[PDB]
Structures are given as structure tokens and as C-alpha cells.
Amino acid sequence: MILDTDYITEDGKPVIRIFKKENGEFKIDYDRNFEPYIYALLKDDSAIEDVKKITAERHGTTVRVVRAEKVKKKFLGRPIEVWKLYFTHPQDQPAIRDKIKEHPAVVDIYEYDIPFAKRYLIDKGLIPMEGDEELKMLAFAIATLYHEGEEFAEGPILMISYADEEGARVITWKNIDLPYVDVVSTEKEMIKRFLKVVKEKDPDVLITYNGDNFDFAYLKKRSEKLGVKFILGREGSEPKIQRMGDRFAVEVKGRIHFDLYPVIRRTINLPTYTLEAVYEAIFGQPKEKVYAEEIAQAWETGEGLERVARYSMEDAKVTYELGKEFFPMEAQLSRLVGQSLWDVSRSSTGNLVEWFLLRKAYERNELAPNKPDERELARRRESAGGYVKEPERGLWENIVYLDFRSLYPSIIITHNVSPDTLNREGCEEYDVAPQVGHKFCKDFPGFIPSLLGDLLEERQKVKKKMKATIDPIEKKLLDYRQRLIKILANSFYGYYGYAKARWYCKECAESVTAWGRQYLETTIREIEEKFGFKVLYADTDGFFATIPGADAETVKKKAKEFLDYINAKLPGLLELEYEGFYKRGFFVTKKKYAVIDEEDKITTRGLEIRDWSEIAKETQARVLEAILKHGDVEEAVRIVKEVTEKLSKYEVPPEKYDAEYYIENQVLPAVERILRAFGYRKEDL
């Protein structure tokens, strides 16, 4: 399988390198015949001879147009003839693109800023991370001597830890009596020992937590200070430090540097992103933090070195565990988007769709539009929000939740919403978005709706293959692919309003939201007027409904009957589904509610919880239980009165003191936010 691609220069000519792992062995394939190129749109084809002679200069080298070729492509749903201009080196493109654009006979230039190594994967139809190859992984972490008024990496590295299938170990230059600690004489010897470990283990993946902005930079500065050959690449190179935006990223040639930090930063939403908080959120297990002051104090003639070595060991161990949890998902994401795991794991959702579209555009001979210039970028201010019903406050019995299956992708497909179909003149059929009035041609399938349709079809083909796959490892992998297709399909709407997007269409985005608001509001009035349901609450693509004075099985039956009715009325791919049944449910405000199923599991959208005392969290759970399991509001009130009395009589442990503070600032605020809708103010208790 393909792990990554890059290029090196030999005699001024680019040489693509394809890093592979085939049949358990590392390989490097070279391609010396891939030519960089750009497209140029001309006002007259006779002008090609003048544009071929356009020159620029990169160093002492004169940059010329090597070869031109007339090509016929599709651009915004219309055929177009452009000239494919070839160059010697990919770095010639930024040097000459402006001179070619400024030529009077040139209307515009295209596909001039697609990185050479990524251009290669797309054009060759190559997909990284494809196959069943087993990748060897190794996580690592470092512990450093920190003092407040010092420069970066002024203090030495105290410990280097690593972890894999064999376990976790710590390399240090102080005598620590632990079985997993390897003692060396100096910091230099510790770094050298780490390099030998990586070289001998030869992992395909190096896993870190913030290694892009800390670990590698620290190791680099210390290796320069100590005169150590910091070679980690499989081809004898040092880690390459790159600038993506305001921060950094690190590549290790021949391997995949998998930094968990950017991945977890976009997967889960947490108040803090410390390694301890992220491990505790994913695995539900606590992890002790040992601060820089404690580590410095312990190192400077300290007995607590075993505690710091254990912290170092746990850093590598949890990094390996987290890497095992997120790597298979990123591998499937890489295979779906068609780019290396290194790029994919560091990319935003908007850029992931862009790479997917760039590949599909090449396969379909679709000329890609350019990224917005600085002027157009400033003009792309977001004007976006679905329908939110104000909830009917109070306690409700036997509530069903109905929602649309992929509402926004269904709208895009059904109404052919795309920049290439927007206000296109000359069609015999159009769909008009309500409120915003944008028209979309229906005669020809649009570029994006066509791909979105194939994504949904591919998702179903993957789901069927998953049910038939006996192999549990492959079943989990197919589960990732099917979930990733859903995520990618549900990213097209956001991509339409993504300011940096090539296929940007604010009109498309507004139209999807407007149609979405229409379908949800139409369905609500339909279930109220034709089935006598009460819609308690609704948000964007679904609603909670019930029949005041009806049995649980009666509500279920009429809900299924409504589904048969409205699904026959809904156009194209739009489909309403039965998501789940709830015995009880109370709706406080927009985005604040709580429901309970027949199993007695409570789902909450406004829970108050580690910067909150256990007494407040326990009372809240007791209140919710009384409301959702017993349906007794009078009991929920009594519980709070009981807890406040136990706190005031000093009968409650302080953590699990100022009795007035824990009543007025802890218990009451956490419980009032739930009992609020009933009219139970703080003065009501």
C-alpha cells in the first residue's frame, strides 16, 4: 500500500517518490516522467504562439513553457477549450503564472497551485492506504527541564518514552529503579538510544500528541546543541519541519508522523485539550498530570523520580492507545479523500471536501475553478441557520422523534443544487428555492449533486458488504468507511459556504437552508392538521411529537401511519424516518431538553457537570430520575429541599465549609436550570 508521496529535484527535474509498504517490506518507487502543468484559457487559439514564448526567472535558470496541448474540458457545466501548459519543475508555476495571466490574450489560468505530490496521486488515480497491509506503529513522548525565564529547549530533555505492542518503556539519564526504565549516562546517550529504538523497530507510523509543535522541535534543538545526527527518516533524513499556517507540522520520510492533537481537536469538543482530558473523554479513565514545577523539583536532587518516570511512561502508553483508536479511522478517511494520512489528519473539513472534489473533477474531465483571490475572499462573509421551534414547556408523555434521512444532501440531489446549475439560462425545467428565490436547472445533473448521489449509493453498497463480512477487523473498517461517507456527504453544505472553496456557492448554501426550513415546517403542520399530533420541539431536520391523551402503542401506530403518508408526498430523495420512542420528555428551551426511553436511559441536552462538585451532580441526577422515571415533579422538589437541609446541617462531605455557598452557588444553580420551565424559580424552594 501507498503511505505517502513527495518529490526531490535531480538536475533541476522533479522526481516523484512513492513510499510503499508491500508484503511487509518498505519500498520507494520513483517516477521521473510526471510533468507539472497549468491550464490557460485564451480569447483566440491563434495567440498560443505568443503565450508559448512567455518567460520568467527562478534563480539563474530561465523558466519557459515546455509544451502546450489543446484540451476540451467541462467548466461550470459548459464545454471549454483550454491550453494545457507544461513546465520543467513544479516551482516554475508560481514564478511564471502571473506573467502568463497578465498576457492580453489570456482570459485566466487554472489548476496552478495544486501541490505536485498531490497532483500526482490524483492524475495517476492512486489511492493511499488501500489494502490489508499491517502497519507497525510506535508512539513517543518527552519530559523536559522547565524554568520560567528560559528560551525554548534551553533545558535538557529529562526522559524519552515510547510505546507499542511490546509495551511502554522510558529512557532516562538518571538512576530510576523501575523495570520499564532504561538508564543511560547522558542526555546525548538517551537521544542516541531513542534513535536506535526507532531504527531497529522500524515503525511505519510514529505517533505523538502535539509532536508537530513541541516534541520534534525540542529534540531537534537538543540534537543540534549536543551534536547528534537526528535521523528518523527511512531514507536517512532528519524530520522535515513545515509551516502550514500560523503553526507547524512535521514529516518523517518513509513513515507517517501521526500527530493526534489536530485530529482530536476536530473530532471531539472539549473545554481543554490536555493529553489527560482527551484520554479521559475517549476511554473514560482518569490520567494523573505531573506539572513542570514538580518535574524540575524532582530532577534537582529529588526522591519523586519514580512518579515522574511513571507519568512519562503513561504519556507514551495513552498516546499509543489513542493512536490505535484514531488511526484506522484516519486511514479510511485518507482512502476516501484520496490523499496521504499525513495531510488528511491535519486538514480541515472544508479542505477534505476540496481534495475529494479535485480528484472527482480530474476523473470527470471537469476543470477546477480557482481559489478566491484576497479581494474575493474578503467579500465572502457568511450570511446560516435552520428552523428552531420554541418548545412547549412542561412535562410530556410518550414522545416520538422523527427526522429526515440526510436532509441537506437529499435537498442538494433532489433540487440539483450546484454553482453550475444556479440561474443557468436556456433550461426547460428549474427548481426555485423558497424565500431566497435562487433557480437551479434540472435538465442536466450538476457536478456536486452527481457526486453526492454516488456517495449515498456507495454508502449503501458498503453497509451491505459490512453485514456479509464475517471478519471482525474488516467489519470495523467497513463501519468506519460507511460512517465517513455519511460525514463527507453532510459536509457538502458547509463546503458551499466555505470562503476558501473553489466550488463556493453562497446561493447554493442559502437555498439548502431555505428548502430545509420549508420541509421541516411543512411536515410539522402536516402532522398537526392531518394527524392531530402536538409538536413539542423541532430543530433543523427533526421534531419531537405526541398525542395529548393517547396510549404509547397508539402514538407509535399513528406515527408509523404519518410516515407512510408524508413519504409518498416528499419529492425525490427526501425521506422522514422513525428514530426512536421516548416514555417521557421535557423541553426547557431551544437546545435544552431531556428525554427517557423504555429502557430508562436518559438523554440530556443541558447537563451541568469536573468543575462542579459531586453533590451538585448527584442531586441533578436524582431530580432528572424523579421526573423521567417516576414522572413526579413534587418529588424532585422535595429532593432539593432535602439536599439543601443536609448541606446546611453539615451532614454532607464538602467535596462529595460555607453551607450558604454550596446552596446558592452550587446546588440551586445546577438544579434551577432544569426545574426552570415548570415556573420553579430559586425562591420557590
Author numbering: 1 to 383, 385 to 610, 613 to 659, 727 to 755
Please quote the paper that reports this structure:
Archaeal DNA polymerases from the B-family (polB) have found essential applications in biotechnology. Variants of the archaeal polymerase from Thermococcus gorgonarius, TgoT, that can either generate HNA from DNA (TgoT_6G12) or DNA from HNA (TgoT_RT521) have been previously identified. In this study, six X-ray structures of DNA and HNA polymerases are reported: (i) three apo- structures of TgoT, TgoT_6G12, and TgoT_RT521-; (ii) two DNA-bound structures of TgoT_6G12 in binary and ternary complexes; and (iii) one DNA-bound structure of TgoT_6G12, which has incorporated two HNA nucleotides. Consistent with all other DNAPs from B-family, TgoT and its variants fold into five distinct structural subdomains.
In addition, another TgoT mutant capable of synthesizing complementary DNA from an HNA template was discovered. This mutant, named TgoT_RT521, is a reverse transcriptase that was engineered de novo. Compared to TgoT, this mutant has only two additional mutations, I521L and E664K. To better understand how the mutations added on TgoT variants impact the structure of the polymerase, the X-ray structures of the apo form of TgoT, replicative polymerase TgoT_6G12, and reverse transcriptase TgoT_RT521 were solved by crystallography. Crystals were obtained for the three polymerases and diffracted at 2.4, 3.1, and 2.35 Å, respectively. Comparison of TgoT_6G12 with TgoT_RT521 structures shows a strong similarity between the two polymerases (r.m.s. deviation for Cα atoms: 0.6 Å). The final apo TgoT_6G12 and TgoT_RT521 structures contained flexible segments in the thumb subdomains. Slight movements in the finger domain (r.m.s. deviation for Cα atoms: 1.18 Å for TgoT_RT521 and 1.1 Å for TgoT_6G12) and in the exonuclease domain (r.m.s. deviation for Cα atoms: 0.8 Å for TgoT_RT521 and 1.0 Å for TgoT_6G12) were observed for both mutants. On the contrary, larger rigid-body movements in the palm domains (r.m.s. deviation for Cα atoms: 2.7 Å for TgoT_RT521 and 2.3 Å for TgoT_6G12) were observed. For example, between amino acids 619 to 660, for TgoT_RT521, the r.m.s. deviation for Cα is 9.4 Å and between amino acids 619 and 650 for TgoT_6G12, it is 7.9 Å.
